[PDB]
Paper text:
The extra α1 helix forms extensive hydrophobic contacts with the minor sheet involving residues F23, L26, F27, Y30 of α1, I230 of β(II), P290 of β(VII), and I253, L255 of β(IV), and sequence alignment shows that these residues are highly conserved in vertebrates. The α1 helix is critical to maintain the structural integrity of the active center; in particular, F23 and F27 directly stabilize the minor β sheet through extensive hydrophobic contacts. In support, the structure of an N-truncated ALKBH1 (residue 37–369, ALKBH1Δα1) determined at 2.3 Å by the Se-SAD method demonstrates that missing of α1 helix (residues 22–32) results in distortion of the co-factor coordination geometry as reflected by flipping away of H287 and disordering of β(II) that comprises H231 and D233. Neither Mn(II) nor NOG was observed in the crystal, and the impaired co-factor coordination of ALKBH1Δα1 in solution was also confirmed by calorimetric titration. Furthermore, enzymatic assays showed that ALKBH1Δα1 was totally inactive in N6-mA demethylation. Although an α1-truncated human ALKBH1 protein was reported to have demethylation activities towards m1rA in tRNA,8 we performed in vitro enzymatic assay using the α1-truncated human ALKBH1 and hardly detected any activities towards m1rA in tRNA stem loop nor N6-mA in DNA bubble, further underlying the importance of α1 helix.
AlkB family of 2-oxoglutarate (2OG or α-KG)-dependent oxygenases are evolutionarily conserved and implicated in nucleotide demethylation. Mouse ALKBH1 protein has 389 residues and consists of an N-terminal extension (NTE), a nucleotide-recognition lid (NRL), and a C-terminal double-stranded β helix (DSBH) domain. By establishing a reliable in vitro enzymatic assay, we demonstrated that ALKBH1 prefers bubbled and bulged DNAs, instead of ssDNA or dsDNA substrates. Structural studies of ALKBH1 in substrate-free and a 21-mer bulge DNA-bound state revealed the molecular determinants underlying the observed substrate preference, including unique features of a stretch-out Flip1 motif and a functionally indispensable N-terminal “α1” helix.
Numbering used by the authors: 38 to 48, 58 to 231, 237 to 348
The structure:
């Protein structure tokens, strides 16, 4: 029995299957409010043998991925949050993250023989309920507000996947660079939502039989994985970043600018030229992941 090829959901291996989305559960205007295409235009796939596994290739409107990258790099990394930098940086010091990256970016010396910027040292950010790894339950403290626009995005994707009533309550944002270390880390009826932006990576989905080789698949910028039940047990972080293709610094979906006119109720905001320079420079060698979970009931 041979080793399968890497599945590319964007074009020896378990059978790929269309997943039917509840296309009338999210209005066309609401999907655009957070930068998503209308659900009817989305593709979604399952895998035979893996109930609870959903894969949604890049369902984002052109240029709207930029809004979600900038939120992860520039806004969600700011207090109030819990952060890997809190080990060494004071809360006041972390407030200078964005201006520092712009300073590194404006320098004419291009070199890695220098201190790493805070953005380059960013590895994880948690929002909402804090998950205490010792206790292996959620904590009563280290609580930070869950950003509402990410909750609106999470709730819509969960609804279209058949999980109406889902509440975004615990988020973790992971930042992986080419030099990231390759480490590895209740009820699971409710889904967790996993978003990817930037460079590509390979998700290894655990074998069904014991000692079986995992099923491989590409995570492209904008891809969303919805996982619950049997398949939520199989979710894990992907710290390995694939280097960008020869000649192509960023995927084409990250090279489309945002619309000039957005709606006036939209949560997608404009992204300035200098702000996108920081995102584009960073994402040249990085992938950002967003994981959203429900906590209460």
């Amino acid at each position: 029995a041979d080793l399968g090829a890497v599945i590319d959901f964007s074009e020896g291996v378990p059978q790929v299957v269309r997943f039917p989305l509840n296309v009338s559960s999210v209005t066309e205007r609401d999907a655009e409010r957070v930068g998503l295409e209308p659900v009817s235009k989305w593709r979604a796939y399952g895998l035979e043998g893996y109930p609870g596994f959903i894969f949604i290739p890049n369902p984002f409107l052109p240029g709207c991925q930029r809004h979600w990258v900038k939120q992860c790099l520039k806004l969600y990394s700011q207090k109030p949050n819990v952060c890997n930098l809190d080990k060494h940086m004071t809360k006041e010091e972390t407030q200078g993250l964005w201006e520092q990256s712009k300073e590194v970016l404006r320098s004419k010396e291009v070199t890695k023989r220098r201190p790493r910027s805070l953005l380059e040292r960013l590895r994880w950010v948690t929002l909402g309920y804090h998950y205490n790894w010792d206790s292996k339950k959620y904590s009563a403290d280290h609580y930070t507000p869950f950003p509402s626009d990410l909750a609106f995005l999470s709730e819509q994707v969960a609804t279209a996947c058949g999980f109406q009533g889902f509440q975004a309550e615990a988020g973790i944002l992971n930042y992986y660079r080419l030099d990231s270390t390759l480490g590895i880390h209740l009820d699971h009826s409710k889904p967790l939502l996993s978003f990817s932006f930037g460079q590509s990576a390979i998700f290894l989905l655990g074998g069904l039989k014991r000692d079986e080789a995992p099923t491989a698949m590409f995570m492209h910028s904008g891809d969303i994985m919805v996982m619950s039940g049997f398949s939520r047990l199989l979710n894990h972080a992907v710290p390995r970043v694939l280097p960008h293709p020869d000649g192509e610094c960023l995927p084409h979906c990250l090279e489309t600018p945002l619309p000039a006119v957005l709606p006036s109720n939209s949560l997608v905001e404009p992204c300035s030229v200098e702000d996108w320079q920081v995102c584009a420079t960073y994402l040249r060698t990085a992938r950002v992941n967003m994981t959203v979970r429900q906590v209460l009931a």
